[PDB]
Design a protein around this ligand. Structure first.
Ligand code: MN
Ligand code: MN
Ligand code: MN
Lengths: 112, 116
DNA sequence: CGCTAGTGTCAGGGGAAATACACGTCGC
DNA sequence: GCGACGTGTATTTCCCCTGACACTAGCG
């Protein structure tokens, strides 16, 4: 029972940080775009500080007023593991595998 | 209907129910068991069955009669799109480098070799 | 006809979200 | 110094889960 009992909201913040470390309101904006609604910072911050104290996020300082949050490798392990569990249960056919890799081929083609 | 309108607001519990049925359609306690092996704890059916009743009214899970004491649950088309759409988001936030990408390429290569 | 499998379900307890309230700071 | 930035936080709210209590239907 490591990354299992996380909340949907929380793991979203984990996959957010997998792309690159960000500073807070930078997370609110990207979460606002996935959900499709305003995410109130009263909800964001408190959940962040629960991951830090469980060893999945590190709340390093950037300004006198800005913080930079990033994934501890223990938190990065949480991202990869339940990504394996979904790929485990998704890739159950030839054509499903051909779909996952054509997804990842496009994802890396936009990388630049 | 689009699955992102609905599937993006679901519980972690509910999203795990989805990924499970994305493997194959199963009946009630088959989900319960194969969810327990993922969590590691117990999964009270008093929580399970209602969470499936939620997914069937949003049009993502189908409920049919195998016999009149056992129903078989399965993802429908909107349900299937909800599973892949959540996969397309996770991947793009994880595929950020050749290093990250390959780790995926070998994760699926292993799971595809495990189908024999 | 006992006993289990298989689901229904609801009052009760629990815990995070809304929605305000608040204060330092960079910027200009 | 006056504006928005960036973050803290609480308590009231609300909703989901925990924990029974229940009922049918197969299996013998
Ligand atoms: Mn806000
Ligand atoms: Mn039970
Ligand atoms: Mn894509």
């Amino acid at each position: 029972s490591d990354a299992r009992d996380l909340t949907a909201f929380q793991k979203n913040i984990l996959t957010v940080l997998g792309e690159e470390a960000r500073y807070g309101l930078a997370i609110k904006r990207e979460l606002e775009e996935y959900y499709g609604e305003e995410v109130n910072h009263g909800r964001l911050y408190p959940n962040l500080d629960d991951l830090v104290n469980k060893g999945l996020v590190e709340k390093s300082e950037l300004d006198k007023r800005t913080n930079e949050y990033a994934l501890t490798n223990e938190g990065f392990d949480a991202v990869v593991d339940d990504l394996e569990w979904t790929l485990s249960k998704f890739v159950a056919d030839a054509d499903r595998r051909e779909r996952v890799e054509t997804i990842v081929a496009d994802d890396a083609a936009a990388l630049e």
